[PDB]
Design a protein around this ligand. Structure first.
Ligand SMILES: [Zn+2]
Ligand SMILES: [Zn+2]
Lengths: 67, 45, 32, 39, 60, 42, 45
């Protein structure tokens, strides 16, 4: 739904690296190189950013219920 | 006495248990109650 | 220019101190 | 629509990745099939 | 609407202010009415207006 | 010409799913029922 | 003798006679419909 704050397995904070990851991918870097540049060594952390699906961008497209 | 919110235009209003269930300005048939004024607390766990 | 435009002999100088068909690059929109 | 910046970036990444996959996977398959043929 | 001293005016609704009428404002309105030679609404008519507004606001 | 690989087969399958969809049979059957079947039943 | 009303036939969603066949992508969100919904079912009661 939205990038988790901590890695499930170990507990490293990965919630502050989603925007940087997208910026790096925008510049043409490969996914492995982008994850390496963010200093994500353990594959337990790498799966958190690699396999995250961002669904909040789909929930936000609905008109807000209040105003 | 109790607030309500329209389901389309999100317009706040109130009803007196005798008005027809309808938004006053767009005539929508579906309305929602507003959130309670009580305190809501969560354990952050 | 890129790695392809490099001379083959100079490419041979790039030695690690090939793609495989079953490692896709991840996507987000898929298709259909 | 006025799409958000993150969605536009994701769309660009998806287009690039689709092109790169369509090239590299096809090249690898062509490389493998000829080797399997000559064996 | 119309000021007593001034003439008739057609105005939109938002021109009026939610703030209450002050003592000098009502005094000036009374002085303008006296200058024109007009009177104030009767207390019976004031009650009739109040009942009309209460009926209209609480109507279903 | 040139040989056909697996990726070309997946391109063709992608075209199939782009046109048809996954529930095309339900919608096609209902459209046939509404367009012509009711009139013939009458 | 003219158009006499004989009944009401339920409409399969996303079919040719559904209101969602048109409306593109943007209006599908304003109607609170998921663009991933595929149709093919009826809505009875
Ligand atoms: Zn970890
Ligand atoms: Zn409304």
């Amino acid at each position: 739904m939205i990038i988790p704050v901590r890695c499930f397995s170990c507990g490293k904070v990965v919630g502050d690296k989603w925007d940087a990851y997208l910026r790096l991918l925008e510049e043409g870097k490969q996914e492995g190189d982008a994850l390496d540049e963010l200093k994500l060594k353990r594959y337990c952390c790498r799966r958190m950013v690699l396999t995250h699906v961002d669904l909040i961008e789909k929930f936000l497209r609905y008109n807000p219920l209040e105003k | 006495g109790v607030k309500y919110t329209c389901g389309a235009c999100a317009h706040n209003f109130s009803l007196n248990k005798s008005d027809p269930v309808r938004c006053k300005e767009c005539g929508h048939r579906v309305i929602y109650k507003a959130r309670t004024k009580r305190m809501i607390q969560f354990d952050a766990r | 220019l890129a790695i392809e435009n490099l001379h083959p002999d100079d490419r041979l100088l790039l030695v690690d101190p090939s793609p495989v068909f079953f490692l896709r690059r991840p996507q987000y929109v898929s298709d259909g | 629509v006025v799409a958000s910046k993150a969605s536009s970036s994701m769309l660009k990444i998806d287009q690039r990745n689709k092109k790169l996959n369509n090239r590299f996977i096809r090249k690898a398959e062509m490389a493998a099939v000829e080797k399997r043929k000559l064996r | 609407v119309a000021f007593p001293n001034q003439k008739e005016m057609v105005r939109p609704l938002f021109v009026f202010s939610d703030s209450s009428i002050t003592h000098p404002e009502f005094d000036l309105f009374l002085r303008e009415l006296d200058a024109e030679g007009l009177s104030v609404m009767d207390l019976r008519d004031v009650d009739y207006k109040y009942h009309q507004l209460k009926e209209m606001s609480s109507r279903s | 010409d040139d040989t056909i690989t697996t990726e070309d087969c997946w391109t063709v399958i992608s075209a199939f799913f782009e046109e048809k969809g996954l529930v095309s049979q339900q919608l096609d059957s209902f459209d046939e029922f509404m367009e012509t079947s009711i009139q013939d039943l009458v | 003798g003219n158009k006499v009303h004989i009944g009401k036939v339920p409409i399969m969603l996303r079919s040719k006679f559904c209101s969602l066949r048109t409306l593109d992508e943007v209006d599908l969100y304003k109607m609170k419909e998921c663009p991933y919904d595929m149709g093919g079912y009826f809505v009875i009661n």
